């Protein structure tokens, strides 16, 4: 009978979770070794261990049918069993799974191994994205130089893997259908446990979209004054190579030429960091300090012993794209980052340490619950601290910002700078998954795959390639997450919910009061706040033990994902910018791009 079985089921789950953690540890070590050191041998090792774990998962999913788990009284036991039924790629036949792994490593290794020739020196051909190409994209204001590096990178990181990407789409679809999802889009969306999640995001995006259009319009206007009308048109999409980022996902690198008040201070602490002799180690130690200051968990010795926080100086190939790793034991957590001493990198350090903190907070949970409440929660943690670190308030405390006067104009500059990262990113993030969803769902014919990408980038972000592209090119995989098969919606969710977390943490810290002019949201510093840390502890320690609205409720008593907080943060900017665009007769919106030939 069911009472006796449920008791047996509890014991079954307890043992199985511990077994799954141990088996996943082995897979994770092999994946770490490959990412840290790309070789044919490490690839083979990584993929063979994954195939072995996949085989075990199949047996697990099969064994769940021996339990009447849907009949059980315990919501907790039912939730754990449900988690185990979800095979993902491991549902594929043995041979198909092996082919998918080989396809995935082919794409990620291609991305990681991209090298281009110097614009001025065709003999020097060892320029990698990180740091060489990204340095040019972020710093150069020579539009032809920028266009050169754009084309070279997209051709090598994107177009080169079209056939592998096509096969990946086929196998991802096959896997999804074996799990009885319609496509990989539904498989990804399942992580958010909400059948209205897409509509919710459409509604939030629509509310914020008008603010994006104002920022876009103003940036385009300012770029015209810098580059001239031969390079930037008033009415067309912005040429994306001028936006300071390879994918135009964040525009903060061009703040010095588009800032509302160029005669007033604009926060850029990179120079001071270098002057004061900052190192990657110091940046991570400072991140550690921020977390512990909030009464959260200190980084364990394994982190310091085993992390890679600087680009290796030997000849080896590796994945330099920053990442945080859980090894599913106790206190074995690691970061791999090719750390540079810049302001932007200080934020990346805090982002990655947010992941690490989440790992530490939930490591006592059973294996199946050792992940984020939803993928967006995991991405949000570090960014909440980054919002605080980025404030003039905090940066003055740590001696990185000197002789700063926070008048009305300096505040607008700072808000605009933040928006160049936070608002600009929203349409970008949405398009990454809108694109892949449309491919997964079979909504775009193979003949139209590349122009379908640029169509979305045009429709949502109002940006376009610097040169004419066609279906002979394939540009999507030039973005890491697309080559590496990492779901992107997590970042759209994060950029919305991080402001919900930040607003609440700031209120708990006594750092934000909407009726107090001396306590504005955009200058809140949660450093040293045990009350803010307590909220994080309450939420993060849950892991995935409960549906995400329960995790949000543990933080601040709310159960709904909302664009209220992000709009509240930027409201003073919205008011000022709307007026400024009217004052300067700024054209808003854009004509359809001519840069992808069908
Ligand atoms: C995705 O969706 C798929 C459906 O589109 C689904 O595939 C189905 O899974 C079913 C398993 O749940 C499976 O059902 C079995 O069918 C057997 C006979 O199938 C043959 O004939 C069919 C035509 O009539 C064909 O379509 C098939 O291809 C086969 O040729 C049955 O023999 C079998 O039965 C046994 O099991 C049931 C279930 O028992 C349950 O558990 C306890 C006992 O442990 C019961 O007390 C309880 O009541 C409960 O029912 C017993 O009742 C029975 O006595 C037998 O022991 C069973 O019905 C089905 O064949 C399969 N395919 C199709 C096309 O339907 C996938 O599983 C889904 N995938 C995922 C990941 O969810
Ligand atoms: C730097 C960061 N890395 C990823 C890593 C994703 C990942 C998942 C699984 C395996 C390898 C890498 C992360 O979320 O930490 C990142 O890609 N981020 C942060 C914000 C937006 C997004 C971007 O830069 O596109
Ligand atoms: C990289 O891997 C190779 C074998 O694939 C190994 O011999 C070598 O020690 C590794 N290099 C480094 C720097 O760890
Ligand atoms: C730190 O957290 C613990 C529980 O994790 C709590 O009991 C303690 O009160 C906190 N310290 C402070 C100063 O709030
Ligand atoms: Zn992240």
XYZ file of C-alpha atoms and ligand atoms in Angstrom:
724
model
C 0.000 0.000 0.000
C 0.865 3.704 -0.393
C 1.782 4.576 3.219
C 4.522 1.909 3.289
C 5.680 2.855 -0.222
C 6.032 6.584 0.530
C 8.360 5.732 3.451
C 10.451 3.543 1.102
C 10.373 6.329 -1.517
C 11.841 8.832 0.966
C 14.776 6.470 1.627
C 15.150 5.837 -2.113
C 15.399 9.575 -2.857
C 17.873 10.255 -0.050
C 20.336 7.651 -1.394
C 19.751 8.541 -5.061
C 20.378 12.263 -4.507
C 23.737 11.513 -2.849
C 24.593 9.156 -5.709
C 23.622 11.803 -8.288
C 25.791 14.448 -6.590
C 28.778 12.084 -6.616
C 28.309 11.074 -10.269
C 27.809 14.714 -11.334
C 30.978 15.721 -9.458
C 32.905 13.425 -11.823
C 31.222 14.913 -14.921
C 31.844 18.453 -13.643
C 35.561 17.780 -13.028
C 35.950 16.565 -16.623
C 34.044 19.609 -17.967
C 36.207 21.925 -15.829
C 39.400 20.277 -17.139
C 38.269 20.758 -20.738
C 37.150 24.383 -20.241
C 40.441 25.171 -18.473
C 42.498 23.335 -21.087
C 41.027 22.597 -24.521
C 42.533 19.451 -26.069
C 41.230 16.516 -28.129
C 42.017 14.302 -25.116
C 40.077 16.419 -22.593
C 37.152 16.694 -25.047
C 36.997 12.898 -25.324
C 37.160 12.555 -21.522
C 34.457 15.196 -20.943
C 32.070 13.692 -23.505
C 32.599 10.066 -22.475
C 31.866 10.807 -18.795
C 28.703 12.718 -19.808
C 27.546 9.762 -21.924
C 28.054 7.536 -18.862
C 26.006 9.867 -16.624
C 23.283 10.117 -19.299
C 22.981 6.318 -19.301
C 22.520 6.326 -15.506
C 19.858 9.067 -15.742
C 17.874 6.907 -18.203
C 17.869 4.104 -15.618
C 16.800 6.595 -12.920
C 13.894 7.939 -15.014
C 12.840 4.352 -15.745
C 13.001 3.472 -12.023
C 10.695 6.373 -11.051
C 7.772 4.507 -12.696
C 8.086 1.797 -10.021
C 6.941 4.420 -7.496
C 3.362 5.701 -7.351
C 4.866 9.132 -6.757
C 1.923 11.179 -8.097
C -0.214 9.519 -5.389
C 1.975 10.618 -2.465
C 0.952 12.949 0.364
C 4.288 14.793 0.539
C 4.582 17.733 -1.867
C 8.346 17.601 -1.235
C 8.710 13.958 -2.296
C 6.535 14.526 -5.396
C 8.633 17.563 -6.365
C 11.868 15.529 -6.109
C 10.477 12.647 -8.197
C 9.232 15.090 -10.834
C 12.741 16.593 -11.038
C 14.168 13.090 -11.681
C 11.761 12.343 -14.554
C 13.161 15.323 -16.475
C 15.897 13.761 -18.605
C 16.663 16.595 -21.030
C 19.311 15.527 -23.554
C 19.837 12.252 -21.650
C 16.544 11.022 -23.154
C 18.281 10.645 -26.540
C 19.410 7.231 -27.834
C 23.036 6.441 -26.901
C 24.390 7.262 -30.385
C 22.362 10.483 -30.771
C 23.514 11.727 -27.371
C 27.165 11.088 -28.297
C 26.701 13.000 -31.564
C 25.105 15.936 -29.730
C 28.002 16.125 -27.249
C 30.496 16.091 -30.145
C 28.458 18.822 -31.853
C 28.369 20.968 -28.689
C 32.105 20.671 -27.993
C 32.846 21.441 -31.679
C 30.906 24.715 -31.390
C 32.252 25.804 -27.988
C 35.872 24.958 -28.924
C 35.519 26.832 -32.236
C 34.338 29.923 -30.347
C 37.136 29.597 -27.791
C 39.832 29.151 -30.458
C 38.924 32.137 -32.678
C 41.971 34.220 -33.661
C 42.045 37.180 -36.054
C 44.773 39.185 -37.793
C 45.783 42.659 -36.620
C 44.066 45.447 -38.593
C 47.398 47.224 -39.114
C 49.652 44.140 -39.260
C 48.556 41.191 -41.433
C 51.510 39.154 -40.099
C 50.260 39.239 -36.493
C 47.334 36.786 -36.401
C 47.032 35.754 -32.735
C 44.405 38.263 -31.569
C 41.739 36.535 -29.463
C 38.342 37.972 -28.496
C 39.456 38.101 -24.858
C 41.319 40.380 -24.431
C 42.607 41.637 -27.819
C 39.486 42.102 -29.972
C 37.249 43.244 -27.082
C 39.859 45.889 -26.244
C 39.567 47.374 -29.758
C 35.746 47.171 -29.842
C 35.499 48.947 -26.474
C 38.220 51.578 -27.037
C 38.593 52.382 -30.765
C 36.539 55.173 -32.317
C 37.840 54.435 -35.834
C 34.675 53.160 -37.518
C 36.547 51.263 -40.264
C 38.845 49.557 -37.742
C 35.743 48.586 -35.746
C 34.025 47.262 -38.895
C 37.106 45.170 -39.745
C 37.184 43.415 -36.353
C 33.406 42.908 -36.411
C 33.532 41.123 -39.790
C 36.603 39.024 -38.927
C 35.100 37.821 -35.643
C 31.555 37.073 -36.883
C 32.908 35.170 -39.917
C 35.077 32.966 -37.654
C 32.861 32.563 -34.566
C 29.531 32.512 -36.386
C 29.569 31.375 -40.007
C 32.177 28.623 -39.472
C 29.789 26.519 -37.345
C 26.552 26.682 -39.374
C 26.430 22.937 -40.131
C 27.160 21.994 -36.498
C 24.502 24.452 -35.316
C 21.954 22.946 -37.738
C 22.609 19.438 -36.373
C 22.393 20.765 -32.804
C 18.919 22.232 -33.530
C 17.813 18.837 -34.929
C 19.070 16.907 -31.896
C 17.796 19.465 -29.369
C 14.353 19.114 -30.997
C 14.592 15.316 -30.946
C 15.501 15.377 -27.227
C 12.654 17.760 -26.356
C 10.071 15.564 -28.102
C 11.403 12.471 -26.290
C 10.595 14.378 -23.099
C 7.167 15.157 -24.644
C 7.804 18.885 -24.965
C 6.819 20.436 -28.311
C 10.370 21.731 -28.818
C 13.493 22.925 -27.003
C 11.708 26.231 -26.361
C 9.140 24.533 -24.105
C 11.884 22.436 -22.497
C 13.705 25.646 -21.517
C 10.504 27.424 -20.446
C 9.650 24.497 -18.144
C 12.381 25.739 -15.753
C 10.144 28.708 -14.842
C 7.171 26.521 -13.768
C 4.578 28.965 -15.109
C 2.445 28.395 -18.208
C 1.975 32.174 -18.699
C 5.680 33.054 -18.378
C 6.159 34.196 -22.005
C 3.140 36.529 -21.867
C 4.310 37.947 -18.530
C 7.661 38.880 -20.066
C 5.962 40.343 -23.168
C 3.860 42.543 -20.845
C 6.871 43.715 -18.810
C 8.991 44.302 -21.913
C 6.173 46.378 -23.489
C 6.097 48.634 -20.391
C 9.875 49.280 -20.529
C 10.166 49.434 -24.343
C 9.266 53.165 -24.638
C 12.172 54.048 -22.315
C 14.519 51.981 -24.502
C 13.330 53.884 -27.611
C 14.218 57.204 -25.931
C 17.697 55.958 -24.981
C 18.220 54.542 -28.489
C 17.127 57.866 -30.048
C 19.416 59.944 -27.845
C 22.435 57.653 -28.354
C 21.948 57.742 -32.160
C 21.729 61.549 -32.040
C 24.972 61.770 -30.046
C 26.746 59.258 -32.322
C 25.819 61.415 -35.354
C 27.627 64.371 -33.747
C 30.713 62.183 -33.230
C 30.937 60.139 -36.452
C 28.919 62.341 -38.836
C 25.873 61.502 -40.946
C 27.838 59.424 -43.484
C 28.384 56.823 -40.718
C 25.151 57.164 -38.691
C 21.757 58.086 -40.157
C 19.020 59.921 -38.245
C 16.260 57.526 -39.223
C 18.019 54.158 -39.662
C 19.071 51.422 -37.210
C 22.326 52.156 -35.366
C 25.433 50.507 -36.911
C 26.244 48.098 -34.091
C 30.063 48.242 -34.274
C 29.914 51.787 -32.846
C 28.253 50.711 -29.596
C 31.368 49.577 -27.696
C 30.432 45.892 -27.535
C 30.807 43.037 -30.045
C 27.101 42.117 -29.752
C 25.833 45.626 -28.857
C 24.337 44.074 -25.712
C 25.502 46.896 -23.422
C 26.659 50.350 -24.520
C 28.472 51.611 -21.407
C 31.860 51.687 -23.193
C 30.710 54.696 -25.291
C 29.397 56.687 -22.304
C 32.237 59.221 -22.679
C 30.804 60.305 -26.058
C 27.040 59.998 -25.345
C 26.741 61.171 -21.702
C 24.012 63.780 -21.041
C 26.411 66.204 -19.312
C 29.981 65.888 -20.699
C 31.274 68.698 -18.439
C 30.071 66.902 -15.299
C 31.623 63.729 -13.797
C 31.124 60.328 -15.382
C 32.128 57.366 -13.217
C 34.947 55.322 -14.738
C 37.185 53.824 -12.038
C 39.457 51.673 -14.262
C 42.312 54.219 -14.182
C 42.216 54.522 -10.371
C 42.102 50.726 -9.964
C 45.311 50.514 -12.023
C 46.884 53.489 -10.200
C 46.205 51.853 -6.810
C 47.756 48.567 -8.008
C 44.601 46.428 -8.045
C 45.073 42.795 -9.075
C 42.563 40.070 -10.007
C 43.199 38.577 -6.531
C 42.346 41.893 -4.832
C 39.126 42.209 -6.883
C 37.961 38.742 -5.773
C 38.970 39.444 -2.158
C 36.896 42.647 -2.295
C 33.906 40.710 -3.640
C 34.351 38.193 -0.809
C 34.428 41.129 1.644
C 31.125 42.503 0.291
C 29.324 39.182 0.857
C 30.789 38.612 4.343
C 29.967 42.239 5.237
C 26.303 41.337 4.708
C 26.667 38.349 7.070
C 26.784 35.929 4.125
C 29.191 33.048 3.538
C 32.955 33.528 3.170
C 34.689 31.881 0.202
C 36.124 28.481 1.234
C 39.801 27.528 0.863
C 39.034 25.271 -2.134
C 37.845 28.349 -4.046
C 41.197 30.120 -3.610
C 43.228 26.931 -4.220
C 41.392 25.771 -7.340
C 39.942 28.826 -9.133
C 41.524 30.338 -12.239
C 41.338 34.130 -11.922
C 43.862 35.207 -14.586
C 44.365 34.149 -18.199
C 47.087 31.437 -18.318
C 50.365 32.622 -19.874
C 51.269 29.343 -21.630
C 50.207 28.599 -25.223
C 47.059 26.683 -24.287
C 43.529 27.081 -25.591
C 40.734 27.592 -23.051
C 37.256 29.063 -22.595
C 37.919 32.576 -21.259
C 34.218 33.440 -21.027
C 33.764 33.908 -17.261
C 31.946 31.156 -15.341
C 31.221 29.841 -11.833
C 31.248 26.145 -10.971
C 29.585 23.942 -8.344
C 31.219 20.535 -7.799
C 28.378 19.202 -5.621
C 30.418 18.122 -2.609
C 31.040 20.430 0.354
C 32.772 23.798 -0.252
C 34.234 22.817 -3.619
C 33.201 25.820 -5.698
C 35.343 27.609 -8.321
C 35.467 30.505 -10.755
C 37.264 30.558 -14.091
C 37.738 34.163 -15.245
C 40.354 35.806 -17.466
C 40.236 38.800 -15.123
C 41.323 42.270 -16.201
C 41.595 45.318 -13.935
C 38.608 47.387 -15.140
C 35.336 48.715 -13.706
C 33.302 46.421 -15.995
C 35.357 43.445 -14.791
C 34.756 44.395 -11.145
C 31.054 43.894 -11.932
C 31.744 40.556 -13.664
C 33.644 39.400 -10.539
C 30.610 40.240 -8.382
C 28.263 38.547 -10.878
C 30.255 35.306 -10.713
C 30.606 35.483 -6.912
C 26.800 35.754 -6.759
C 26.656 32.296 -8.356
C 29.248 31.003 -5.879
C 27.267 32.351 -2.915
C 24.103 30.636 -4.198
C 26.043 27.323 -4.419
C 27.213 27.711 -0.803
C 23.765 28.718 0.482
C 21.999 25.629 -0.879
C 24.737 22.958 -0.682
C 22.932 21.300 2.283
C 19.862 20.657 0.076
C 19.287 17.300 -1.631
C 21.015 17.177 -5.033
C 17.882 17.861 -7.121
C 17.317 21.097 -5.164
C 20.923 22.310 -5.584
C 20.145 24.879 -8.285
C 18.396 28.270 -8.518
C 14.708 28.840 -7.723
C 14.624 29.546 -11.441
C 17.519 30.274 -13.854
C 16.863 34.041 -13.507
C 17.349 33.928 -9.723
C 20.874 32.538 -10.146
C 21.827 35.326 -12.564
C 20.371 38.080 -10.359
C 22.304 37.550 -7.100
C 25.692 39.005 -8.082
C 24.111 41.841 -10.079
C 22.263 43.082 -6.974
C 25.659 43.627 -5.334
C 27.030 45.084 -8.598
C 24.267 47.715 -8.547
C 25.535 48.685 -5.088
C 29.247 48.556 -6.005
C 28.503 50.814 -9.014
C 27.089 53.682 -6.912
C 29.138 56.828 -6.316
C 28.343 56.174 -2.626
C 30.206 52.848 -2.557
C 32.994 53.810 -4.962
C 33.903 56.831 -2.801
C 34.030 54.577 0.308
C 36.635 52.325 -1.326
C 38.705 55.254 -2.631
C 38.094 54.541 -6.325
C 36.052 57.697 -6.991
C 37.688 61.001 -6.018
C 36.534 64.660 -5.977
C 32.974 63.689 -6.986
C 30.152 66.214 -6.597
C 26.731 64.562 -6.815
C 24.593 67.356 -8.276
C 21.501 66.882 -10.497
C 23.590 66.647 -13.673
C 26.079 64.127 -12.260
C 23.078 62.028 -11.143
C 21.611 62.011 -14.673
C 25.035 60.977 -16.031
C 25.150 58.057 -13.564
C 21.559 56.965 -14.256
C 22.211 57.110 -18.004
C 25.408 55.089 -17.576
C 23.477 52.445 -15.621
C 20.720 52.382 -18.282
C 23.322 51.859 -21.040
C 23.922 48.530 -19.275
C 20.521 47.651 -17.793
C 17.813 48.930 -20.169
C 19.763 48.477 -23.423
C 20.291 44.804 -22.510
C 16.577 43.970 -22.256
C 15.684 43.817 -25.961
C 19.042 42.118 -26.648
C 18.377 39.352 -24.120
C 14.808 38.794 -25.351
C 15.981 38.361 -28.993
C 18.608 35.737 -28.106
C 15.883 33.322 -27.033
C 13.147 34.571 -29.390
C 15.562 33.620 -32.190
C 16.438 30.165 -30.875
C 12.803 29.489 -29.875
C 11.707 30.206 -33.452
C 14.335 27.747 -34.767
C 13.475 25.083 -32.151
C 9.751 25.415 -32.919
C 10.435 25.030 -36.664
C 8.978 28.460 -37.416
C 11.834 29.541 -39.716
C 12.949 27.668 -42.855
C 16.692 26.832 -42.980
C 17.004 29.097 -46.038
C 16.027 32.084 -43.854
C 17.944 31.422 -40.612
C 20.485 34.256 -40.757
C 18.181 37.052 -41.851
C 15.703 35.835 -39.205
C 18.421 36.647 -36.628
C 19.096 40.154 -37.925
C 15.359 40.818 -38.361
C 14.850 40.347 -34.604
C 17.913 42.417 -33.699
C 16.434 45.162 -35.928
C 12.814 44.862 -34.676
C 13.661 44.853 -30.960
C 17.010 46.654 -30.537
C 17.165 48.939 -33.603
C 20.719 47.898 -34.425
C 22.250 46.373 -37.579
C 25.547 44.883 -38.843
C 28.227 47.340 -40.081
C 28.343 45.513 -43.432
C 25.773 43.769 -45.632
C 25.166 40.160 -44.548
C 23.245 37.392 -46.302
C 22.267 33.744 -45.929
C 25.871 32.942 -46.887
C 26.799 34.156 -43.390
C 25.565 32.722 -40.092
C 25.984 35.220 -37.303
C 24.088 33.939 -34.237
C 26.844 31.590 -32.901
C 29.236 34.567 -32.710
C 27.603 35.054 -29.289
C 29.098 32.694 -26.668
C 25.785 31.436 -25.257
C 24.545 30.476 -28.705
C 27.716 28.462 -29.494
C 27.741 26.963 -25.973
C 24.003 26.116 -25.861
C 23.241 28.254 -22.800
C 19.633 29.424 -22.408
C 19.477 33.244 -22.432
C 16.025 34.080 -21.005
C 17.585 33.720 -17.540
C 19.308 37.061 -18.212
C 16.113 38.876 -19.245
C 14.457 37.544 -16.082
C 17.524 38.533 -14.027
C 17.647 42.124 -15.293
C 13.991 42.557 -14.240
C 14.062 40.736 -10.879
C 17.462 42.115 -9.761
C 15.742 45.486 -9.295
C 13.010 43.842 -7.209
C 15.763 42.335 -5.023
C 17.814 45.565 -4.976
C 14.848 47.796 -4.044
C 13.873 45.444 -1.198
C 17.447 45.001 0.081
C 17.892 48.793 0.010
C 14.675 49.334 2.004
C 15.743 46.673 4.553
C 19.166 48.349 4.773
C 17.524 51.734 5.454
C 19.191 52.968 2.257
C 16.055 53.728 0.232
C 13.033 55.825 1.117
C 10.933 57.149 -1.828
C 9.824 60.118 0.309
C 13.392 61.083 1.288
C 15.488 63.094 -1.202
C 18.696 62.065 0.610
C 17.960 58.341 0.111
C 17.481 57.749 -3.637
C 17.418 54.193 -5.032
C 20.200 54.908 -7.545
C 22.669 55.739 -4.744
C 21.888 52.857 -2.357
C 24.798 50.884 -0.916
C 23.943 47.590 0.803
C 27.552 46.983 1.898
C 27.661 45.903 5.545
C 23.908 45.301 5.800
C 23.075 42.177 7.820
C 19.363 42.831 7.237
C 19.810 42.695 3.444
C 21.998 39.592 3.875
C 19.303 37.902 5.989
C 16.823 38.248 3.111
C 19.386 36.700 0.740
C 20.032 33.873 3.197
C 16.282 33.162 3.540
C 15.803 32.965 -0.226
C 19.070 31.402 -1.447
C 19.195 28.597 1.147
C 15.972 27.249 -0.396
C 17.610 26.462 -3.737
C 14.968 24.819 -5.928
C 13.094 23.162 -3.023
C 10.022 25.300 -3.743
C 8.528 27.002 -6.837
C 10.198 30.383 -7.418
C 7.302 32.562 -6.184
C 7.878 30.969 -2.750
C 11.571 31.892 -3.004
C 10.703 35.499 -3.874
C 8.224 35.518 -0.959
C 11.044 34.422 1.380
C 13.063 37.462 0.254
C 10.475 40.273 0.405
C 6.969 38.783 0.788
C 6.087 39.204 -2.903
C 5.111 36.395 -5.298
C 5.008 38.188 -8.665
C 7.732 39.045 -11.196
C 7.280 42.768 -11.836
C 8.765 45.608 -13.885
C 7.712 48.092 -11.179
C 11.136 48.204 -9.482
C 13.240 48.733 -12.619
C 10.898 51.523 -13.795
C 11.091 53.112 -10.326
C 14.907 53.102 -10.451
C 15.022 54.851 -13.843
C 12.018 57.185 -13.422
C 14.197 60.311 -12.878
C 16.086 59.406 -16.076
C 12.838 58.827 -18.027
C 11.498 62.258 -17.013
C 14.757 64.012 -17.953
C 15.359 62.073 -21.186
C 11.847 62.485 -22.611
C 12.235 66.248 -22.091
C 15.774 66.318 -23.518
C 14.724 64.447 -26.669
C 11.866 66.924 -27.210
C 14.243 69.848 -26.537
C 16.676 68.556 -29.182
C 13.984 67.411 -31.660
C 15.401 63.877 -31.475
C 14.033 61.350 -33.964
C 12.637 58.257 -32.246
C 12.256 54.843 -33.906
C 13.943 53.390 -36.982
C 13.355 52.228 -40.546
C 13.757 48.538 -41.458
C 17.411 47.568 -41.952
C 18.919 46.976 -45.408
C 21.861 45.012 -43.994
C 20.614 41.425 -44.509
C 19.994 40.377 -48.114
C 17.353 37.641 -48.454
C 5.469 10.633 -23.741
O 4.174 10.272 -24.194
C 4.085 8.948 -24.681
C 2.665 8.727 -25.193
O 2.492 9.437 -26.396
C 4.457 7.941 -23.582
O 4.546 6.643 -24.126
C 3.610 5.737 -23.514
O 3.973 5.409 -22.187
C 3.125 4.493 -21.514
C 3.752 4.204 -20.158
O 3.147 5.050 -19.211
C 2.905 3.187 -22.290
O 1.820 2.497 -21.698
C 2.001 1.063 -21.669
O 1.476 0.432 -22.823
C 1.681 -0.972 -22.883
C 1.154 -1.505 -24.212
O 1.548 -0.628 -25.240
C 1.523 -1.304 -26.512
O 0.302 -1.136 -27.216
C -0.015 0.201 -27.596
C -1.323 0.199 -28.383
O -2.374 -0.285 -27.575
C 1.106 0.849 -28.421
O 0.866 2.233 -28.546
C 2.482 0.646 -27.784
O 3.501 1.071 -28.669
C 2.689 -0.814 -27.370
O 2.785 -1.630 -28.515
C 0.995 -1.665 -21.704
O 1.353 -3.026 -21.654
C 1.388 -1.024 -20.379
O 0.545 -1.554 -19.375
C 1.296 -1.898 -18.190
O 1.485 -0.797 -17.320
C 0.276 -0.207 -16.869
C 0.632 1.056 -16.090
O 0.598 0.756 -14.714
C 0.681 1.929 -13.877
O 1.370 1.665 -12.657
C 0.773 0.713 -11.772
C 1.486 -0.636 -11.874
O 2.868 -0.479 -11.623
C -0.739 0.562 -12.003
O -1.356 0.035 -10.851
C -1.377 1.900 -12.366
O -2.765 1.750 -12.584
C -0.704 2.527 -13.589
O -1.551 2.432 -14.715
C -0.534 -1.227 -16.052
O -1.806 -0.706 -15.735
C -0.707 -2.553 -16.797
O -1.201 -3.535 -15.912
C 0.600 -3.032 -17.436
O 1.467 -3.538 -16.443
C 1.295 0.506 -20.435
O -0.055 0.921 -20.461
C 2.595 3.454 -23.765
O 2.696 2.255 -24.497
C 3.562 4.472 -24.365
N 3.289 4.769 -25.772
C 2.123 5.141 -26.320
C 2.147 5.382 -27.804
O 1.066 5.294 -25.699
C 5.808 8.277 -22.944
O 6.006 7.487 -21.792
C 5.897 9.752 -22.566
N 7.257 10.061 -22.165
C 7.558 10.679 -21.024
C 9.023 10.922 -20.773
O 6.716 11.049 -20.203
C 29.676 36.463 -17.784
C 28.370 35.659 -17.654
N 28.556 34.161 -17.798
C 27.701 33.264 -17.750
C 27.900 31.792 -17.877
C 26.945 30.769 -18.465
C 27.336 29.327 -18.510
C 26.359 28.306 -18.091
C 26.720 26.886 -18.139
C 28.058 26.481 -18.604
C 29.033 27.503 -19.022
C 28.677 28.913 -18.976
C 27.018 33.280 -16.376
O 25.800 33.367 -16.298
O 27.730 33.241 -15.326
C 27.387 36.085 -18.812
O 27.430 35.444 -19.923
N 26.491 37.115 -18.655
C 26.247 37.970 -17.456
C 25.176 38.869 -17.892
C 24.768 38.668 -19.187
C 25.578 37.504 -19.812
C 26.453 37.965 -21.059
O 27.519 38.501 -20.922
O 25.899 37.686 -22.183
C 46.405 20.244 -21.001
O 46.021 18.923 -21.325
C 47.100 18.112 -21.726
C 46.574 16.792 -22.278
O 45.342 17.010 -22.933
C 47.988 17.881 -20.515
O 49.058 17.030 -20.860
C 48.532 19.216 -20.033
O 49.202 19.035 -18.804
C 47.428 20.254 -19.862
N 48.063 21.553 -19.769
C 47.992 22.296 -18.669
C 48.707 23.612 -18.721
O 47.382 21.951 -17.657
C 24.266 36.343 10.900
O 23.480 35.256 10.461
C 23.088 34.384 11.498
C 22.362 33.186 10.898
O 22.971 32.826 9.677
C 22.197 35.133 12.480
O 21.799 34.275 13.528
C 22.953 36.324 13.047
O 22.096 37.092 13.865
C 23.493 37.184 11.911
N 24.342 38.232 12.444
C 23.915 39.486 12.554
C 24.888 40.479 13.115
O 22.787 39.841 12.219
Zn 25.727 34.281 -14.521
